[PDB]
């Protein structure tokens, strides 16, 4: 997230939470982890005021 | 008998509950021969609790010893010592079903040892220093009453120990066909069964008690239990197997325990069964049972409930047991003695009066109406209530047995209270659908259907078989012990011989003679780790013996061909059938069903209450609600959450709307929601609702 | 529809039963006809009949996992004290018959009522919400059935015999009709080959440009080269749907039913799977499956197989002796030399066992269980792993066919007494990681129709590579089926293949693939720009309905459902 | 706390005496409906006298 | 299409009850907010169809929306 | 307030909202479920809540 | 070994050399050691205890 | 080719209650068939008489023994249920059987009146000692298949009367196979062979008619379509 | 003695030659013992006549195809086999049926002799291009259920011939279904549908009456051993 930004941590989320559950071969549609992974990102931590 | 040799790390002193670590559970090398590796209980309390061995001793010191054969420089000797685990560490231990001379040499130069790291290793014959004493040594007494324990994985062999416990005792007990050598013991040493305690004659015999006439000039008289109640509701009976002018010998059996039969246990029927699917009514391991079971009572049990009621004093007044009671029609009272208890032999219905029980209540003040009413009438009035004892709604019987204790004869009443009465009620139970059945081998499924018996597949011969058991289930749930079992079944019910021509046959080389020809309905031990190996028992399916009829249903691989029942074509392929030993567990369907549409709630919460009580209510928990709102049901959520629990003003408006068929009013606010608000302004937070 | 018991159903039903025996006369006033119910009087089943029936209850088991695990049904008396269940909706319970307990409630209200015939009617459930594929299908013994069914065997009776010197052709039949006929005659098989005129029967895809390019109509009849039973079984699926002509297992089935869902409404898959479920049970009642000792065949190699594999274990023991390997080194060699003997004795299995024997023909079905577990039943255990994890060098040479030695067995345990005690952790941290979902994304709900935004995410339909092929790609399924697409699809030349804001389907996937291009651009809940909640468009279409979301959809629930339904399926 | 754990409580399984009874509740209606209104108006001024 | 005739609470078919609504959601409210007002007549507008022997009002309510005989305003 | 209570620390949430004096909007249906209001979501919604039916004059004529 | 046993035909090829013990010693033994039994002391001694307690 | 041939039926006694009889020739597919529709009605539908109920002397319920008896009131009922018994009237009828002192009791000591029938005296109900002392009174009614005991309260019936469930059917085993005939088509034709064994009450002929009856008049159904 | 219950025959007419009777209340195990009896003895009693074997002159040997007609024999052999002929008498005889020119061959072209009806003369035989020439002769016998075509070895030496399979039985489909019902005290009652399909020359309501009559005399060979045996008789 701090270096390659936040279009590039959802995708790595989403990858490594996908995968794990792939191995077993339990199918899960991407939208649901999505819709998780939405909620971890309402906040920014503030620096100047 | 497996409950007093029981093994427990919880309690008070050990293994506190709330921590139960997760490392200890699992098997360590020294178990072999002292704490059963099988049986352990299914839930939480896994691996904590075990049986101990068959043949584990206790040293003084609280160390389980075990018993081993000192072996020499090859040959093993007479002289069983027993060792703990840290002195049997130094030495090797050589397996029991390895091979040995007539003296006592080992025939193969290498053999099959234990070690000190507790593993299993090959030496030779020099190294070798003792031996185990029996193959059955590691297991304990119940894992070892399951025959072809070797061909079924732990789980499987785990749940049958465990279920070959919850076996209820029916009405006529019979031996299995097929099982171990252990049977005998584990009745005798239960203490279940009568025994001689003195050599002599049997003199007169009774179904109430015995006497017996030992060789010394002495009499000795012993009672039998009759339809006893047990801790767990079933019935301890007992009766005779002797008659008179037999000579009995010290320690013959005499009378049979519940689950015993010739003195061997008897935890179950054995009858035939078919391995196939049968039209998907036995789909998802489900089992499908031939009408005749309930014909002729073969799982028929006999169950007995204790009720009780106490009479004691109030400060208005004394409680009294009486025929009469207020408000009822006087047919209510029919088997009811003079002083309020019911006769011996009624039948008892559901709801009936058990014992009649008035108490003080002095609340004169009636509604007018009721003033009315009974002016009308003859019931003018009385200052009493109808508290009597009723049977619980759903049990039903006919009454056995009655015990009154009163404070009249000083009998030790804890204080506080003038006269008790228990009364006996017994009923019989014949299976049913919903009834729970289950082999030796965890192979344990509900009763889908029970099927004519013009409707059940039967041989040629004309007999229709009494159970199928679903395929699917055997290869993937892994327990192909129960394949052997009920050929080995078939076996034993129809006699077996074997023809001596060209000399005994190849596959019989190491049988012994005895086994060579039995009649039918002969019964056969397979013991445990030294059964027989599957090329026997293929000799004995192809050697098998003729019906009355000169033919043999069942060819030399164990299947045979059935007929539709429904349709009456025969089935396209052979089938395989034999005999099967089930047991009827515990978990009836009988007791566990219940339901409630509208009665007693709970003070303090407002809330229906649950468990064993009448009217016992279901709990909506939080993954239900997670489910609901996950439908987006919003409106049934709220109804199940205010309407039906705890909506005090609403219950009865929706009931009295259903009774009159109007449109149910919206729920109010419930009792938690004003409860939680009166909590949090106790608190001095001024919690106020806005809008 | 559901049994219910008689007493049960009575008891529960009370109220409604008194309100209707005082309006039929049958009491003077609540009390009578409370009093007459507490005997159970015979003359009022009547009246539970009509109360009872279009009387939705819902079904729910423990422990509820997903929103399938409540489900209404239609109930209808039946005699005893147990509830019958439905076979199809068990997996989507995960329920099983060695002794399961359900609960019941009734919906009171008539809000509450309309939404258990509307929301939670079973039969409108057959897509998981997962995944969006169906969850009621044919299991166990249902396949198995099918399978016998459409399987095809040369060497049989009534056979299609070309037309020779002295005879034309044999296996012709003008019907069906015919050829049932000719079956209970006993001189047809249901699994040889023949050929049939179809007039019912829609032909094949292929086969109708070259018959009735026109088009085709009922009663159009055509010739089909195909068994009885693939024609028996092709009557069950809608008559629109074209003749398939393949030997049904699992995964074809799953396509089957998958290909119905997208192109008809949900009461039509409804009424196939039912009519899938009597077929499948009523043949696999003939099918002959069943266990034996001498049906479960003994490699005969195997003799020859650890023979010689006792000669490496030996070399390896004896190289230890010297200290020339380490013993962990020593312990390696041994679980690779014993794993090699165990792939030996599997593929020499699998090489033996013919093809119709029971075991392999369940295993091979797709009906239940596993290759693994075949070999360990036949051929052998093989090695087994300790309380720390560790490989006991020592395997298993014996089969639970050929009788376990007493030490083996007693090794064996250990592994199966770890794993039958990690089932309970397993579900605790299950149920702790869906708590916690379940908490953090408790207010994603569909508030708005669409957000109105342009900013999607990128997705991979083909793979390929410098020189090769385009092939959909291994994971189409979970990351691109089911979107909507934000930018229009445009290949090399300009042509848009697909308008923006359409749904991607399996149809819309292959014409993309068709179109030869690789990366689109897919709408998320990750870009969606909405206040509150989220907005229907970029979450896609429904996983339970194969439609667009409605406004109001509580997905945050169904999302962490989803995600903790594998809670015991995890293990390392 | 009673049960060999911490989640049940001594009270809990506390059955009210008082707790309102709905078919009761409705009985009565259905009597006040009965009595009151059907058989008192059978004897006018003689069946006054019974309603004070 | 060739689909058999609904049985039971099925009938009538579900898909076609869709096209007469927003979605799942809306039907239901219309639906019971129908049923309500038959409750209402039945006990003192009265069902628009010909009713069965005892038919239960919810089911008179779906009959009567699977010819789209009455209408709906959705009260944002 | 109400599910911050409900979590980890209801002392402190119900201190700080108490001196902060502030008070919870019933959006999100862990406070709904809690309350026993109907849930917003679903048929709850306000707008499938409100929906009005009313026959056809063909249908009543 | 137990007079009234039914004759039961076993597949057993290996001999018992030792008979399986009392399935109830574990209790009784012990009990009887609590009590201090002289029926237990006998057997104490003859382990080669001296003083038994 | 429509042979003008119809179905004859040929009996042959085995035993005193084993009957095996040939119906032939039937076109072909019917053996089965007919075997099925016979064995379905003779196991289930062959009407007869069983004991209702029992009294005994000095017991008030089933779950008591009665001093002297070795077997218990249960075993009694057990042995009981296997008694064959036949009665030429419909309504109930009454049977005694009364035993003193020490001997043993069996179904050849019973008593009973015009119209009933035991046909198994060998067998064993009790043994009695020497102050042994049984008296029993057993209720016959006539009946078909499997009934239940009925409550004494749901009959009215006073404290004492022990209902026992009702065995009427008297059919003990029934098989069937089929075979191929010669006589007009090679292999074309059925020939199908049936047989009963019944208990002593009736013999298999008997049964068989009234098998044959019911079936007739179930299908005079179908017939009366016209 | 009396049945329980009296069960009753209701009919639906699901068409022109397809019907489904119910029949209810049936006493429990009764429902399987009439549907299979019935639904063979339908399928095997009711006699009829069929073609059973064929002559071609333009075909000798090499069945493949008949010059100068677009069908193929195999093809013409079904639209033989699916036709409908009713015999008076069971004589074995012979038919024949000749035409010439471009057009369509039916069944109405046919010309039957004495005593044999066809009741499908819309039934579409082939068709015939320009200069055809379609010769064929038929042989039509009485029969009882479905026979397969016998083989010819023995008197092939008439080399032409070509035997078919013979449907003799007018009904074409029947499948029973045993449903639950209720009395009204008990649930375990049973209604028997069944679904018979029959062709033009019947209709399903003789056919299940000839089954049922057939039936009944079956079973009077046995219920003749000993008629003062009591039976279950649902009286009248
Ligand atoms: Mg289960
Ligand atoms: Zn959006």
Not at chain 2, 549 to 568: C, H, N, W, Y
Request: with cysteine; aromatic share 6%.
């Amino acid at each position: 997230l701090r270096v390659q930004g936040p279009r590039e941590v959802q995708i790595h989320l989403v990858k490594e939470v996908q995968e794990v559950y792939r191995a077993q071969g339990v199918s899960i549609h991407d939208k649901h982890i999505e819709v998780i992974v939405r909620q971890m990102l309402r906040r920014v931590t503030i620096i100047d005021s | 008998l497996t409950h007093k040799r029981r093994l427990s790390a919880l309690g008070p002193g050990g293994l506190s509950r709330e921590r139960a670590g997760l490392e200890v559970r699992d098997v360590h090398p020294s178990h072999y021969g002292r704490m059963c590796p099988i049986e352990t209980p299914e839930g939480p309390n896994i691996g904590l609790i075990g049986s101990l061995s068959v043949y584990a001793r206790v040293n003084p010191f609280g160390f389980i010893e075990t018993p081993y054969r000192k072996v020499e420089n090859g040959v093993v000797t007479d002289q069983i010592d027993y060792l703990t685990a840290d002195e049997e560490d130094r030495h090797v231990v050589a397996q029991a079903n390895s091979p040995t001379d007539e003296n006592g040499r080992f025939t193969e130069d290498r053999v099959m040892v234990r070690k000190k790291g507790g593993e299993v290793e090959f030496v030779s014959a020099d190294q070798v220093d003792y031996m185990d004493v029996s193959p059955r040594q590691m297991v304990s007494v119940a894992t070892a009453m399951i025959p072809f324990l070797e061909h079924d994985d732990a789980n499987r062999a785990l749940m049958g120990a465990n279920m070959q416990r919850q076996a209820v005792p029916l009405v006529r007990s019979e031996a299995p066909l097929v099982g171990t050598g252990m049977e005998l013991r584990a009745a005798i040493d239960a203490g279940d069964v009568v025994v001689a305690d003195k050599t002599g004659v049997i003199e007169e015999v009774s179904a109430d008690y015995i006497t017996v006439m030992a060789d010394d000039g002495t009499r000795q008289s012993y009672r039998l239990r009759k339809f006893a109640r047990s801790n767990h509701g079933t019935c301890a009976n007992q009766r005779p197997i002797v008659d008179a002018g037999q000579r009995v010998e010290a320690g013959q059996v005499i009378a049979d325990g519940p689950c015993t039969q010739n003195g061997e246990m008897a935890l179950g029927k054995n009858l035939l069964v078919a391995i196939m699917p049968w039209e998907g009514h036995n789909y998802e391991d489900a089992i499908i049972l031939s009408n005749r079971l309930v014909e002729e009572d073969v799982l028929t049990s006999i169950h007995i409930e204790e009720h009780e009621i106490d009479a004691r004093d109030t400060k208005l007044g004394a409680e009294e047991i009486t025929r009469d009671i207020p408000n009822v029609s006087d047919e209510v009272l029919a088997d009811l003695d003079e002083r309020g208890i019911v006769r011996i032999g009624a039948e008892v219905r559901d709801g009936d009066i058990l014992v009649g029980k008035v108490t003080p209540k002095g609340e004169t003040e009636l509604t007018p109406e009721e003033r009315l009413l009974r002016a009308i009438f003859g019931e003018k009035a009385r200052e009493v209530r109808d508290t009597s004892l009723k049977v619980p709604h759903g049990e039903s019987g006919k009454v056995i047995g009655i015990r009154v204790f009163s404070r009249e004869d000083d009998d030790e009443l804890p204080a506080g209270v003038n006269e008790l009465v228990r009364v006996y009620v017994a009923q019989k139970r014949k299976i049913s659908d919903g009834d729970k059945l289950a082999g030796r081998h965890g192979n344990k499924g509900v009763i889908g259907k029970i099927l004519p018996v013009e409707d059940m597949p039967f041989l040629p011969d004309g007999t229709p078989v009494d159970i199928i058991l679903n395929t699917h289930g055997v290869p993937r749930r892994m327990n192909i012990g129960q394949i052997l079992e009920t050929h080995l079944g078939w076996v034993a019910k129809a006699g077996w011989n074997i023809d001596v021509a060209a000399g005994v046959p190849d596959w019989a080389s190491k049988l012994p003679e005895e086994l060579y020809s039995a009649p039918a309905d002969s019964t056969v031990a397979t013991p445990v780790f030294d059964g027989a190996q599957e090329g026997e028992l293929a000799g004995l399916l192809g050697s098998t013996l003729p019906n009355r009829d000169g033919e043999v249903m069942v060819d030399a691989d164990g299947k045979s061909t059935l007929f539709d029942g429904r349709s009456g074509e025969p089935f396209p392929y052979p089938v395989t059938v034999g005999y099967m030993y089930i047991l009827k567990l515990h978990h009836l369907v009988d007791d566990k069903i219940h339901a409630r549409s509208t009665g007693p709630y709970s003070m303090i919460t407002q809330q229906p209450l649950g468990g064993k009580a009448q009217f016992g209510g279901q709990r909506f928990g939080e993954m239900e609600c997670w489910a609901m709102q996950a439908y987006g049901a919003a409106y049934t959520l709220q109804e199940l959450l205010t309407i039906k629990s705890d909506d005090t003003v609403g219950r009865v408006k929706v009931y009295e709307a259903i009774v009159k068929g109007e449109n149910i009013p919206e729920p109010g606010i419930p009792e938690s929601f004003k409860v939680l608000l009166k909590e949090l302004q106790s608190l001095c937070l001024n919690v106020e609702v806005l809008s | 529809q559901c049994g219910l018991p008689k007493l049960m159903a009575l008891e529960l039903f009370k109220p409604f039963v008194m309100k209707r025996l005082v309006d039929l006369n049958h009491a003077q006033n609540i009390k009578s006809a409370k009093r007459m119910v507490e005997r159970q009087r015979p003359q009022v089943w009547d009246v539970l009949e009509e109360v009872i029936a279009e009387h939705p209850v819902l079904l729910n088991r423990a422990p509820t996992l997903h929103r399938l695990g409540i489900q209404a049904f239609e109930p209808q008396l039946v005699e005893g004290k147990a509830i019958q269940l439905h076979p199809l909706v068990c997996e989507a319970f995960n329920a099983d018959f060695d002794g399961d307990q359900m609960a019941v409630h009734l919906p009171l209200s008539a809000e509450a009522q309309a939404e258990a015939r509307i929301l939670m009617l079973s039969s409108n459930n057959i897509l998981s919400p997962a995944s969006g594929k169906p969850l009621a299908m044919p299991r166990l013994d249902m396949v198995t059935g099918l399978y016998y069914l459409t399987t095809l065997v040369e060497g049989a009776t009534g056979e299609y015999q070309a037309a020779t010197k002295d005879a034309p052709e044999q296996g012709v039949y003008s019907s069906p009709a015919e050829a049932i006929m000719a079956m209970d005659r006993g001189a047809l098989s249901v699994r040889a080959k023949i050929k049939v005129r179809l007039t019912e029967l829609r032909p094949p895809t292929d086969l109708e440009a070259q018959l009735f390019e026109n088009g085709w109509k009922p009663g159009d009849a055509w010739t089909a080269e195909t068994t009885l039973g693939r024609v028996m079984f092709n009557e069950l699926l809608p008559k629109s749907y074209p003749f398939v002509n393949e030997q049904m297992h699992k995964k074809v089935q799953a396509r089957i039913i998958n290909d119905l869902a997208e192109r008809f409404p949900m009461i039509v898959v409804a009424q196939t799977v039912d009519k899938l479920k009597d077929a499948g049970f009523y043949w696999a009642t003939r099918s002959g499956v069943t266990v034996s000792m001498a049906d479960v065949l003994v490699p005969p190699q195997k003799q020859e197989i650890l023979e010689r594999h006792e000669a490496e274990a030996d070399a390896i023991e004896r190289k230890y002796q010297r200290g020339a390997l380490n013993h962990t080194e020593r312990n390696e060699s041994l679980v690779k030399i014993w794993q090699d003997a165990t792939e030996e004795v599997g593929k020499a299995l699998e090489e033996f066992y013919p093809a119709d024997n029971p075991i392999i023909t369940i295993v091979k079905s797709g009906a239940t269980g596993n290759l693994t577990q075949t070999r360990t039943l036949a051929g052998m255990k093989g090695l087994v792993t300790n309380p720390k994890g560790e490989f006991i060098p020592r395997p298993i040479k014996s089969s639970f066919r050929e009788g376990l030695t007493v030490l083996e067995y007693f090794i064996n345990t250990h592994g199966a007494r770890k794993g039958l005690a990690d089932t309970a952790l397993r579900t605790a941290d299950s149920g702790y990681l869906t708590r916690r979902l379940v908490d953090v994304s408790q207010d994603v709900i569909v508030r708005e129709h669409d957000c109105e935004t342009e900013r999607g995410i990128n997705v991979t339909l083909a793979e390929r590579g410098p020189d090769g092929t385009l092939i959909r790609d291994a994971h189409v399924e979970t990351s691109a089926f089911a979107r909507t697409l934000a930018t229009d699809a445009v290949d090399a030349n300009g042509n848009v293949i697909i308008e923006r804001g359409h749904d991607l389907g399996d149809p819309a996937i292959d014409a993309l693939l068709a179109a030869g291009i690789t990366t689109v651009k897919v709408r998320s809940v990750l870009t969606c720009t909405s206040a509150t909640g989220v907005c229907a468009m970029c979450y896609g279409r429904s996983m339970a309905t194969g439609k667009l979301v409605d406004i109001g959809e509580a997905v945050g629930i169904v999302a962490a459902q989803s995600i903790g339904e594998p809670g015991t399926q995890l293990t390392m | 706390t009673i049960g060999d754990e911490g989640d049940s409580q001594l009270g809990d399984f506390i059955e009210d005496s008082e707790a309102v009874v709905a078919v009761d509740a409705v009985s009565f209606t259905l009597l006040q409906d009965q009595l009151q209104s059907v058989l008192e108006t059978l004897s006018e001024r003689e069946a006054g006298v019974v309603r004070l | 299409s060739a689909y058999d005739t609904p049985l039971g609470i099925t009938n009538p078919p579900i898909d076609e009850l869709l096209s007469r609504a927003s979605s799942k959601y809306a039907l239901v409210i219309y639906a019971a907010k129908r049923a309500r007002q038959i409750n209402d007549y039945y006990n003192q507008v009265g069902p628009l169809v010909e009713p069965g022997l005892q038919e239960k009002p919810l089911s008179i309510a779906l009959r009567e929306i699977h010819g789209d005989l009455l209408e709906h305003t959705e009260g944002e | 307030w109400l599910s911050a209570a409900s979590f980890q620390e209801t002392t402190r949430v119900l201190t700080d909202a108490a001196i902060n004096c502030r008070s919870d909007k019933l959006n999100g249906l862990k406070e709904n479920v809690i309350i026993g209001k109907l849930i917003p979501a679903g048929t709850g919604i306000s707008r499938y809540r409100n929906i009005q039916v009313q026959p056809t004059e063909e249908a009543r004529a | 070994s137990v007079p009234g046993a039914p004759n039961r035909v076993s597949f057993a090829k290996l001999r018992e050399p030792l008979e399986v013990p009392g399935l109830l010693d574990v209790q009784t033994d012990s009990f009887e050691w609590l009590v201090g039994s002289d029926r237990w002391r006998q057997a104490a001694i003859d382990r080669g205890e001296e003083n038994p307690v | 080719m429509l042979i003008s041939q119809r179905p004859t039926l040929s009996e042959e006694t085995v035993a005193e209650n084993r009957s095996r009889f040939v119906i032939e020739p039937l076109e072909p597919g019917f053996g089965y068939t007919l075997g099925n529709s016979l064995r379905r009605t003779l196991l289930s539908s062959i009407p007869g008489a069983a004991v209702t109920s029992i009294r005994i002397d000095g017991v008030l319920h089933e779950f008591t023994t009665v001093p002297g008896v070795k077997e218990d009131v249960t075993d009694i009922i057990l042995n009981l249920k296997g008694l064959v018994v036949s009665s030429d009237d419909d309504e109930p009828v009454t049977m005694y059987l009364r035993k003193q002192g020490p001997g043993v009791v069996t179904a050849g000591d019973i008593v009973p009146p015009a119209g009933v029938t035991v046909h198994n005296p060998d067998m064993h109900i009790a043994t009695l000692n020497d102050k042994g002392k049984l008296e029993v009174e057993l209720v016959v009614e006539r009946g078909r298949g499997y009934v239940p005991a009925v409550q004494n309260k749901a009959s009215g019936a006073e404290i004492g009367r022990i209902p026992v469930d009702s065995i009427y059917s008297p059919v003990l085993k029934v098989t069937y196979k089929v075979e191929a005939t010669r006589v007009e088509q090679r292999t074309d034709f059925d020939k199908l062979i049936i047989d009963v064994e019944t208990k002593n009450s009736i013999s298999p002929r008997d049964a068989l008619a009234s098998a044959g009856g019911t079936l007739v008049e179930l299908f005079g159904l179908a017939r009366e379509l016209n």
